[PDB]
Amino acid sequence: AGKKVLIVYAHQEPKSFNGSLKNVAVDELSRQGCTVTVSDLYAMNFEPRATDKDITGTLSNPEVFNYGVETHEAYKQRSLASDITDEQKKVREADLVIFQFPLYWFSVPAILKGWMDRVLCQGFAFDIPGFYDSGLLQGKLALLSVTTGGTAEMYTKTGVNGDSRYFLWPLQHGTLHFCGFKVLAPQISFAPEIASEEERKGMVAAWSQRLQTIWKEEPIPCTAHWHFGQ
Amino acid sequence: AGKKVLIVYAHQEPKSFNGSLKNVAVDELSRQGCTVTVSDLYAMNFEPRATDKDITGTLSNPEVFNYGVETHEAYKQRSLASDITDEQKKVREADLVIFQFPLYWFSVPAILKGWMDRVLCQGFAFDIPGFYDSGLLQGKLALLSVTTGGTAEMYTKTGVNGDSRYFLWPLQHGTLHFCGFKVLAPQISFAPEIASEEERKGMVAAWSQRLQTIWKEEPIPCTAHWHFGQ
Numbered sequence: 013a014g015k016k017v018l019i020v021y022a023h024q025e026p027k028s029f030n031g032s033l034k035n036v037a038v039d040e041l042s043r044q045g046c047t048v049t050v051s052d053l054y055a056m057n058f059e060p061r062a063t064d065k066d067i068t069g070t071l072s073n074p075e076v077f078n079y080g081v082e083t084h085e086a087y088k089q090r091s092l093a094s095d096i097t098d099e100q101k102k103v104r105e106a107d108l109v110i111f112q113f114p115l116y117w118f119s120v121p122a123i124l125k126g127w128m129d130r131v132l133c134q135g136f137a138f139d140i141p142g143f144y145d146s147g148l149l150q151g152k153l154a155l156l157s158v159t160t161g162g163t164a165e166m167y168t169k170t171g172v173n174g175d176s177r178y179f180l181w182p183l184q185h186g187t188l189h190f191c192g193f194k195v196l197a198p199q200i201s202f203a204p205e206i207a208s209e210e211e212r213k214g215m216v217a218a219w220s221q222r223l224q225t226i227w228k229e230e231p232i233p234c235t236a237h238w239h240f241g242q
Numbered sequence: 243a244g245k246k247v248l249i250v251y252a253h254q255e256p257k258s259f260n261g262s263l264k265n266v267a268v269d270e271l272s273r274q275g276c277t278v279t280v281s282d283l284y285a286m287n288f289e290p291r292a293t294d295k296d297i298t299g300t301l302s303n304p305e306v307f308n309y310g311v312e313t314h315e316a317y318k319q320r321s322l323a324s325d326i327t328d329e330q331k332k333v334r335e336a337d338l339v340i341f342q343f344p345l346y347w348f349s350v351p352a353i354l355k356g357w358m359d360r361v362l363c364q365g366f367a368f369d370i371p372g373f374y375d376s377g378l379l380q381g382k383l384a385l386l387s388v389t390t391g392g393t394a395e396m397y398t399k400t401g402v403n404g405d406s407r408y409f410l411w412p413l414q415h416g417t418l419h420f421c422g423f424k425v426l427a428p429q430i431s432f433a434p435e436i437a438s439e440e441e442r443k444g445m446v447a448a449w450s451q452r453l454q455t456i457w458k459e460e461p462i463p464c465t466a467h468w469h470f471g472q
C-alpha cells in the first residue's frame with residue numbers, strides 16, 4: 013500500500029456517466045486505502061490558454077514571447093503561476109494519474125488539453141535529455157479513461173472512425189509516454205448514451221472491478237506497432 | 243474566382259514563425275484578390291471551455307447538463323453565445339479554412355481545440371446522419387499549417403515520434419472530414435527553432451509559393467490508409 017492517485021477529471025455535470033466513473037474510482041481507490049486527489053477542471057474554472065500570465069515576475073525575453081522557453085525557465089526559477097504549480101505538486105506526489113473525460117473531436121476536451129499544455133512543461137515532465145522511456149515522470153503510471161459517443165464497431169480498423177488506438181496515439185504516446193509515464197491499458201466506455209442502463213452499470217462495474225487490481229497491471233507497450241499494427 | 247478564406251490562428255507572439263506564416267498567407271491570398279479573414283484566437287482571448295455559458299436560453303434539461311444536447315438545441319433555437327455564432331459565420335462564408343498553429347502535444351494548442359469544440363456543433367457542422375462525406379461543411383476545403391519542435395526525421399515511421407501523418411488523424415479525419423471538409427495536404431514547417439535563418443526564410447517562402455497555386459490543388463484521400471499505410 014501507500015499508493016497515491018491523481019484523477020484529472022473533465023466533465024461539466026456531476027451526474028454524468030463521466031462523473032460516475034470518477035466517483036467509482038474515488039470510492040474504490042479510497043476503500044483500498046490509497047491516497048486520492050481529484051482535479052475537477054470545470055469546477056476549478058481551469059485556465060486552458062497558454063499565455064504570458066503563466067509566468068510571474070520578469071520574463072526571460074519580454075520583447076518576443078516563446079511559451080516553451082519562458083515556462084522552462086520559470087519552472088527552473090520557481091516562477092510559474094500557482095494554478096500550474098498546484099497541479100505539478102499533485103502529479104509529483106501521484107503514483108498513478110487517471111484522466112477521466114468524454115472524447116471531444118478524437119481527443120480530450122479543450123479544458124483538459126490546456127491542463128496538459130500548461131502543467132506538463134519542460135523541466136518538470138520532460139527535458140533534453142529525458143523523454144519517452146527516460147521522461148521525467150518515469151516510475152509513474154497513467155491511464156486514460158475515455159467515454160465516447162460512437163460505438164465500438166465504429167472504432168475498428170475498417171470502421172468509419174478507425175481503430176480507437178489511432179486516436180490514442182497523441183495522448184498515450186505523444187504526451188504520456190513522452191513524459192515518461194508507463195501507460196496502463198486505456199479504459200474505453202463506448203457509447204453510454206446509446207447503451208441500456210444494464211449495459212451502463214456493466215461498464216461502470218468493469219471499471220470498479222478493474223480498479224480492484226489496478227496495481228497488478230502491466231503497462232502496454234506504447235509503440236507505433238501497438239497503436240497501428242495488426 | 244471570388245474565393246473566401248478564413249485563417250484560424252493560434253500563436254501568442256506576432257513576431258513568431260507562426261505569425262510570419264499567417265502574415266505571408268494574408269499577403270499572398272490578398273494579392274490574389276481573395277477575401278481573407280483571420281481569427282487571432284489569443285488576441286481575441288477566445289474562450290476554450292465548453293460550458294453552460296455557451297447556451298443562453300432555457301435548457302432542454304436544466305437538471306442534468308449535456309453539452310452536446312444543449313448546444314445542438316441552442317444552435318437550432320439561436321441561443322448560442324455570440325462568440326460561437328461569430329465564428330460560425332466566418333466558417334459558413336469561407337471556401338477554405340486554414341489553421342495556423344504550433345504543434346502542442348501532437349495536437350492543437352488548447353485555445354484552438356476549444357474553437358473546434360465550441361464552434362463545430364451539431365446542426366452547424368454535422369448532423370446525425372450528416373457526417374464524414376455527408377457532413378454539413380461539405381464543399382469547403384480545410385488545411386492544417388503546422389510548425390514543430392521536432393525535425394522531419396524525428397517524425398518518420400522509424401523516428402521516435404512516428405510518422406507526421408499519425409498525429410494528423412484526429413484533426414484531419416476525426417474533426418475536419420467528419421464535418422464534411424475536403425482536406426488539402428498539410429503544410430508542416432519542421433523545427434524552425436533549430437533551423438538557420440536562411441532555412442527559416444526558405445520555409446516561409448515555400449508556403450507563400452504553395453499558396454500561389456492552392457486553388458488548383460486536389461484534396462487528400464482522408465482515409466486510414468493515407469494516414470497509416472498498409
Ligand SMILES: Cc1cc2nc3c(=O)[nH]c(=O)nc-3n(C[C@H](O)[C@H](O)[C@H](O)COP(=O)(O)OP(=O)(O)OC[C@H]3O[C@@H](n4cnc5c(N)ncnc54)[C@H](O)[C@@H]3O)c2cc1C
Binds near residue numbers: 162205
Ligand atoms: C464537443 C464534442 C465533441 C465530441 N467528439 C466526439 C468524438 O470525437 N467521438 C465520439 O465518439 N464522440 C464525441 N462526442 C460525444 C461524447 O464523447 C459523448 O457524448 C460522451 O462521451 C458521453 O459521456 P457523458 O459522461 O457525457 O454521458 P452522459 O450523457 O452524461 O451519460 C450517459 C447516460 O448514462 C447515465 N448514467 C450516469 N451515471 C450512471 C451510472 N452510474 N450507471 C448507469 N447509468 C449512468 C446518465 O444518466 C446518462 O443518461 C463529442 C461530444 C462533444 C460535446
Ligand SMILES: Cc1cc2nc3c(=O)[nH]c(=O)nc-3n(C[C@H](O)[C@H](O)[C@H](O)COP(=O)(O)OP(=O)(O)OC[C@H]3O[C@@H](n4cnc5c(N)ncnc54)[C@H](O)[C@@H]3O)c2cc1C
Binds near residue numbers: 062079080259434
Ligand atoms: C506546450 C507545448 C507543447 C509542444 N508539443 C510539441 C509536440 O508535441 N511536438 C513537437 O514537435 N513540438 C512540440 N512543441 C514545440 C513547438 O511546436 C514549437 O516550439 C513551435 O512549433 C515553434 O514555432 P514558433 O512559431 O513558436 O517558433 P518561433 O520560436 O517563433 O520561431 C523560431 C525562429 O524563427 C524566427 N522567425 C520568425 N519569423 C521569421 C521569418 N519570417 N523568417 C525567418 N525567421 C523567422 C523567430 O524569430 C524565431 O527566432 C510544443 C511546445 C509547447 C510550448
Ligand SMILES: CN(C)c1nc2c(Br)c(Br)c(Br)c(Br)c2[nH]1
Binds near residue numbers: 118161166417
Ligand atoms: C454528439 N454526439 C452524439 C456525437 N458527436 C460525435 C462527434 Br463530434 C464525432 Br467526430 C463522432 Br465520430 C461521433 Br460517433 C459523435 N457522436
Ligand SMILES: CN(C)c1nc2c(Br)c(Br)c(Br)c(Br)c2[nH]1
Binds near residue numbers: 080134187348393
Ligand atoms: C519545446 N520543444 C522544443 C519541444 N517540445 C516537444 C514536445 Br512537448 C514533444 Br511530445 C516532442 Br516529440 C518534441 Br520533438 C518537442 N519539442
Ligand SMILES: [Zn+2]
Binds near residue numbers: 189233234
Ligand atoms: Zn509510446
Ligand SMILES: [Zn+2]
Binds near residue numbers: 464
Ligand atoms: Zn478522413
